[PDB]
Design a protein around this ligand. Structure first.
Ligand SMILES: [Mg+2]
Ligand SMILES: [Mg+2]
Ligand SMILES: [Mg+2]
Ligand SMILES: [Mg+2]
Ligand SMILES: [Mg+2]
Ligand SMILES: [Mg+2]
Ligand SMILES: [Mg+2]
Ligand SMILES: [Mg+2]
Ligand SMILES: [Mg+2]
Ligand SMILES: [Mg+2]
Ligand SMILES: [Mg+2]
Ligand SMILES: [Mg+2]
Ligand SMILES: [Mg+2]
Ligand SMILES: [Mg+2]
Ligand SMILES: [Mg+2]
Ligand SMILES: [Mg+2]
Ligand SMILES: [Mg+2]
Ligand SMILES: [Mg+2]
Ligand SMILES: [Mg+2]
Ligand SMILES: [Mg+2]
Ligand SMILES: [Mg+2]
Ligand SMILES: [Mg+2]
Ligand SMILES: [Mg+2]
Ligand SMILES: [Mg+2]
Ligand SMILES: [Mg+2]
Ligand SMILES: [Mg+2]
Ligand SMILES: [Mg+2]
Ligand SMILES: [Mg+2]
Ligand SMILES: [Mg+2]
Ligand SMILES: [Mg+2]
Ligand SMILES: [Mg+2]
Ligand SMILES: [Mg+2]
Ligand SMILES: [Mg+2]
Ligand SMILES: [Mg+2]
Ligand SMILES: [Mg+2]
Lengths: 66, 25, 81, 118, 181
RNA sequence: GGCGACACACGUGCUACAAUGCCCACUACAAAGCGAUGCCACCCGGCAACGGGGAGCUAAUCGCAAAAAGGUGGGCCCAGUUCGGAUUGGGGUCUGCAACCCGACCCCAUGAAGCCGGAAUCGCUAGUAAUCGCGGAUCAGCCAUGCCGCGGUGAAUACG
RNA sequence: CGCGGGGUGGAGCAGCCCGGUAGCUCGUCGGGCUCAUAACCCGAAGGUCGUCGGUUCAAAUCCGGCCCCCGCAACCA
RNA sequence: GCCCGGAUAGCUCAGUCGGUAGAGCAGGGGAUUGAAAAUCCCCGUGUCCUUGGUUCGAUUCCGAGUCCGGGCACCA
RNA sequence: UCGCCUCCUAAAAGGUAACGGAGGCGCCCAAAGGUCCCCUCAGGCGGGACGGAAAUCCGCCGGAGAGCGCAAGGGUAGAAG
């Protein structure tokens, strides 16, 4: 890397809905991230929270008992 | 507005009652 | 909506429930579009009426609560020009 | 700061700035304010980043929202069409569904006028 | 800076699982990971290289490395384009700096992608490298959303020493690349 | 089944484009009409539509009934918005043998066009015009924003 | 055959020199005014440029062929 | 090559005893119109052909400069 | 039509005619010049947000079909690009 006009890239910290990613090693140390999927909410480390498919399911169940 | 049923003023127009125009005098 | 409810017409409601345990399945002409469809209807072949004629309709699971006259439309369009 | 999907509101109010998310507003909004126990009159500009990950988690978890919500509506209609049902033929032809009248103004559903001769 | 968790993670536990799976006579034959190349094609910036000076500024922030600037190969009419102008920024990162970036991309970026039900698993190029591309820049930690004027995504190239995709898919899987199966 | 069609075109309208304005809370002042096959107080369940229960009245004697604007207070801070609610997704209530075509209503989500409208063109001379709610006729329910009436607050301007 | 001009919305003309965005009058369609039509007013739609090649980054535009159209010429014999 | 003449908002472009920029059909806004057109009231860097230079100061002084006119000229 | 350049006619050296067949020039470039150092094309398939037959990016195959300021020819990547 030519010397000048370049980000420092110094060991970092970082955060989330989870704890730290202590890998770090970035520009601009100590960053705060919204939330991740990995850290396993939201897809990876599959929760399938909030989940769908009721619409074909529904008008079956309630329907002829009501 | 008189057309927004999700308001006080709207329901009054439509003549109806509900969560946005409950009946207690 | 209804709920304390579930209105189907006895006319075919019978003839479908019959074709349940007989073991046989056939093509049934109804004038009742007011009634609801499924689950013991599903897989059967019903001819609904549009006011003009009897129209074949295949039944399936996602046809669930839909009144029989949905799947048999009344007027004719084909664009303007 | 940013709640489900991305959708960053700010300044103004909080009960208000909640609407700016897809799936949320008025009712759903004024609800999550008491149920995370947060002051509705605050401005999302300032509040503890604690209440934020409280509020995010409730809203984002409680009910499905902007990405997955929109795509489910899409998915209902996909099924309302292609089932072959009437309510979905008025989807195919881009025409008004729930009752109403097409001899005169359908415009919102019909698009702008395309005039013709007499 | 030579430590970098994901690199570590490659040697202890990605390589071994990779030998034991495909089986390898030689120490080298097992897939190494070379050269993620980040490229922003920007016609967006065309007559304006003012735009460009911020974009390149922005990539350097995320990569720790500034891009070079690609220039217009030939002249093409139907959308503007004299053969002079800048079309885009492109940066080739390897060796550490690729890892330190790859790490954040796996742990942070893609999580913050709206929806994101996982990476396309058909984008291996058949000789066993994988390209993917992003629709916006603010899914990176280094970007604060108040430093964005306008949204420009990029193309990510990843070149594997793997001779097949079957092999290359494995390497990145075990590395932690989320796939749509 | 259709009269409810939909590339379009015209008349009559309603709701608006917002800060003399919007919303939420509380506090007030009308008239005319209707109803014991009906109006239904008050009690309870439900966010609510409404459902149970149930008292009074052939009705200046009980019920529809809350009048609304207004008022007082606080909230919004000029933003396609706490403007505006069309469209659509989902969930229900009621009438009715039955609400797919074609009912009205309630909740949740969605929130469109629209930032005072070309040429043109309508109404009104005072308790009128604007604006604000209320009743009946028909009627099972209802597409009533219509029609026939009721009072509330209340201008401007006529040289000629 | 010969030399010159042309071929573009429905009609009549621009634009082609000088490459990059096709204009004008009528006509047509929707609205207005009138009892009504006309006139008049407010809006709009509509050409790939005879054709096939070629040149350029790009062709109504520059070049080549052919197809029409008008025009001038065809004398000593 | 010469002599000089014509050099401005969007158009004719009008205005050089040095200190400041202007009108008419235009363009828009307003009355006026049932037709349009007169008439009437308001708003337009146009850094005035270009650059160094001279005094407070320069549409306005000097050297080059740039573009255009009849009129001269010349052309192995 | 008249001078200049390229290709054929031209009969494997040169040259060679016709109111024979076809096309170009009357410029251009202060870098499009000298030198030193590097670099290698078109195209095809596969991959990749906005990217489309085509903008840029990555992989493999690609000996010259690209480029060489403009006509053709000769030439040229072991460079003339
Ligand atoms: Mg509102
Ligand atoms: Mg019911
Ligand atoms: Mg309707
Ligand atoms: Mg593949
Ligand atoms: Mg490879
Ligand atoms: Mg009728
Ligand atoms: Mg209809
Ligand atoms: Mg109306
Ligand atoms: Mg009551
Ligand atoms: Mg209760
Ligand atoms: Mg009751
Ligand atoms: Mg009432
Ligand atoms: Mg708009
Ligand atoms: Mg629904
Ligand atoms: Mg119905
Ligand atoms: Mg119906
Ligand atoms: Mg406004
Ligand atoms: Mg109007
Ligand atoms: Mg009078
Ligand atoms: Mg009424
Ligand atoms: Mg009634
Ligand atoms: Mg009634
Ligand atoms: Mg009503
Ligand atoms: Mg006409
Ligand atoms: Mg061409
Ligand atoms: Mg003679
Ligand atoms: Mg010569
Ligand atoms: Mg040869
Ligand atoms: Mg020879
Ligand atoms: Mg010879
Ligand atoms: Mg290639
Ligand atoms: Mg490709
Ligand atoms: Mg060559
Ligand atoms: Mg050549
Ligand atoms: Mg050659």
């Amino acid at each position: 890397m030519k010397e000048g006009i370049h980000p420092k890239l110094v060991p970092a910290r970082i955060i989330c809905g989870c704890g730290n990613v202590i890998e770090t090693y970035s520009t601009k140390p100590e960053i705060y991230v919204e939330v991740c999927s990995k850290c396993h909410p939201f897809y990876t480390g599959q929760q399938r929270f909030v989940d769908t498919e009721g619409r074909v399911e529904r008008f079956q169940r309630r329907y002829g008992d009501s | 507005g008189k057309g927004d049923r999700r308001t006080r003023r709207g329901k009054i127009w439509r003549g109806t009652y509900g969560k946005y125009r409950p009946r207690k005098k | 909506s209804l709920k304390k409810g579930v209105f189907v017409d006895d006319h075919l409601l019978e003839k479908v429930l019959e074709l349940n345990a007989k073991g046989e399945k056939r093509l049934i002409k109804t004038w009742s579009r007011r009634s609801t469809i499924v689950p013991e209807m599903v897989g059967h072949t019903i001819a609904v009426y549009n006011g003009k004629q009897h129209v074949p309709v295949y039944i399936t699971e996602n046809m669930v609560g839909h009144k029989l006259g949905e799947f048999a439309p009344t007027r004719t369009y084909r664009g303007h020009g | 700061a940013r709640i489900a999907g991305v959708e960053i509101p700010r300044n103004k109010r909080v009960d208000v700035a909640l609407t700016y998310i897809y799936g949320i507003g008025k009712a759903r909004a004024k609800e999550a304010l008491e149920k995370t126990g947060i002051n509705p009159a605050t401005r999302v500009k300032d509040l503890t980043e604690a209440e934020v990950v409280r509020l995010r988690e409730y809203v984002e978890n409680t009910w499905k929202l902007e990405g997955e919500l929109r795509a489910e509506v899409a998915a209902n209609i996909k099924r309302l069409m292609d089932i072959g049902c009437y309510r979905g033929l008025r989807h195919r032809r881009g025409l008004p569904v729930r009752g109403q009248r097409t001899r005169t103004n359908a415009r919102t559903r019909k698009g702008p006028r395309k005039t013709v001769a007499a | 800076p030579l430590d970098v968790a994901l690199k570590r993670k490659y040697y202890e536990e990605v390589r071994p699982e990779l030998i034991r799976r495909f089986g390898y006579q030689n120490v080298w034959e097992v897939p190494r990971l070379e050269k993620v190349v980040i490229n922003q094609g920007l016609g967006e910036a065309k007559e304006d290289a003012r735009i460009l000076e911020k974009a390149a500024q922005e990539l350097a922030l995320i990569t720790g490395q500034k891009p070079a600037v690609t220039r217009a190969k030939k002249s093409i009419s139907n959308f503007k384009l004299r053969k002079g102008m800048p079309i885009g920024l492109r940066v080739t990162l390897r060796r550490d700096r690729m890892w330190i970036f790859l790490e954040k991309l796996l742990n942070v970026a893609l999580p913050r992608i709206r929806d994101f039900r996982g990476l396309n698993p058909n984008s291996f190029d058949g000789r066993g490298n994988y390209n993917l591309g992003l629709r916006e820049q603010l899914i990176f930690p280094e970007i604060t959303y108040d430093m964005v004027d306008a949204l420009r995504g990029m193309d990510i190239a990843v070149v594997t020493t793997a001779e097949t995709d079957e092999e290359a898919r494995a390497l990145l899987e075990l590395l932690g690349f989320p796939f749509r199966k």
